[PDB]
RNA sequence: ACUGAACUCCUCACACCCAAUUGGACCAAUCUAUCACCCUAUAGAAGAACUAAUGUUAGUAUAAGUAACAUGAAAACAUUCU
Ligand SMILES: [Mg+2]
Ligand SMILES: [Mg+2]
Ligand SMILES: [Mg+2]
């Protein structure tokens with residue numbers, strides 16, 4: 222099982238590494254900007 | 266016969282010019298948790314960034330040193346005159 226030793230190939234897994242899993246939460250878009258929102262949920 | 270453009274070719278480098286709406290990836294600053302020690306990495310947040318709403322608080326221009334405004338005269342400030 223190469224997993225544990227492959228992990229041993231790095232420094233100590235400190236608190237600086239606990240990443241949310243990619244696909245954890247979709248981006249919290251503030252309803253604005255040049256791309257997502259110009260009228261923010263109501264239209265003209 | 267030329268001159269005449271993002272049409273096209275010419276050499277690089279090409280996924281870099283609609284309307285809403287939707288869908289994905291990055292980040293301005295701050296706080297926190299570990300890092301780090303001239304502005305820093307990665308994560309959880311969240312009152313999270315403005316050329317404007319006939320917005321409001323402070324400052325300050327302009328119109329401008331303009332529009333408008335006051336002390337009867339004289340005299341040693343005794344007093345006289347109008
Ligand atoms: Mg072309
Ligand atoms: Mg288009
Ligand atoms: Mg940045």
Ligand SMILES: [Mg+2]
Pocket residue numbers: 313
């Ligand atoms: Mg905000």
Ligand SMILES: [Mg+2]
Pocket residue numbers: none
């Ligand atoms: Mg402003």
Ligand SMILES: [Mg+2]
Pocket residue numbers: none
């Ligand atoms: Mg204003």
Ligand SMILES: [Mg+2]
Pocket residue numbers: 331
């Ligand atoms: Mg004038």
Ligand SMILES: [Mg+2]
Pocket residue numbers: none
């Ligand atoms: Mg005058």
